[PDB]
């Protein structure tokens, strides 16, 4: 409950950038100007990233669809962290993008589209 009163409300803005920038970073990785322990893989695109990776797992405890939007918003991360010290785990870096869906928690227009879909499965 963001807009609960204003104080517990602006706690939403601190979730916006943590996304509207978590995305910004996820894209700059693929940049050519920024690209065994190297063939797979400390580094900014790992710095400001976890700078929010645990920031997520925080409210992650502070079920439902809207919630799974934060679980999967951190799942693929600790998954590859887990072995072969020396194309799997590939299906998980591409799943980091779903993090954009975390926006629906503050985008009514977006969530509207959500039901507009399930309420149209037979159409699609």
């Amino acid at each position: 409950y963001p807009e609960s009163s204003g104080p517990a409300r602006i706690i939403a803005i601190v979730s916006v950038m943590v996304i509207l920038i978590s995305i910004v970073s996820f894209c700059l990785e693929t940049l050519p100007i920024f690209r065994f322990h190297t063939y797979s893989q400390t580094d900014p695109f790992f710095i400001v990233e976890t700078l929010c990776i645990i920031w997520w797992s925080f409210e992650f405890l502070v079920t439902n669809i809207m919630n799974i939007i934060d679980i999967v918003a951190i799942i693929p991360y600790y998954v590859t962290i887990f072995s072969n010290k020396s194309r799997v785990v590939q299906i998980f870096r591409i799943m980091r993008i779903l993090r954009i869906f975390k926006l629906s928690r503050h985008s009514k227009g977006l969530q509207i589209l959500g039901q507009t879909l399930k309420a149209s499965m037979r159409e699609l």
């Binding site: 700059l28 693929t30 227009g109 977006l110």
Partner: protein
């Protein structure tokens, strides 16, 4: 706003898919995700320049949806705006 927000979504979303689907290519026309953006927009809006297209299968699958989703996306906030003109036009008439 809604129109743009959706696009932005479909774009960042589809640009990423088409990339990790071409990544492994001696021809991939997508240097990176931010690059694909151009492709994303042009595809969703059904312009189809051609100055950038998927060569692999994964990409062409991704692209297929990108074209379809493009229609659905735009074809939502638009109708409203359509009515708003529908009105105002005849009101002051």
């Amino acid at each position: 706003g809604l129109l743009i927000f959706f696009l932005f979504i479909g774009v960042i979303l589809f640009s990423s898919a088409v990339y990790f689907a071409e990544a492994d290519e001696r021809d991939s026309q997508f240097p990176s995700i931010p690059d694909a953006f151009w492709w994303a927009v042009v595809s969703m809006t059904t312009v189809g320049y051609g100055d950038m297209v998927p060569t692999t299968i994964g990409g062409k699958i991704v692209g297929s949806l990108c074209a379809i989703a493009g229609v659905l996306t735009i074809a939502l906030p638009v109708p409203v705006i359509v009515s708003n003109f529908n009105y105002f036009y005849h009101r002051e008439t």
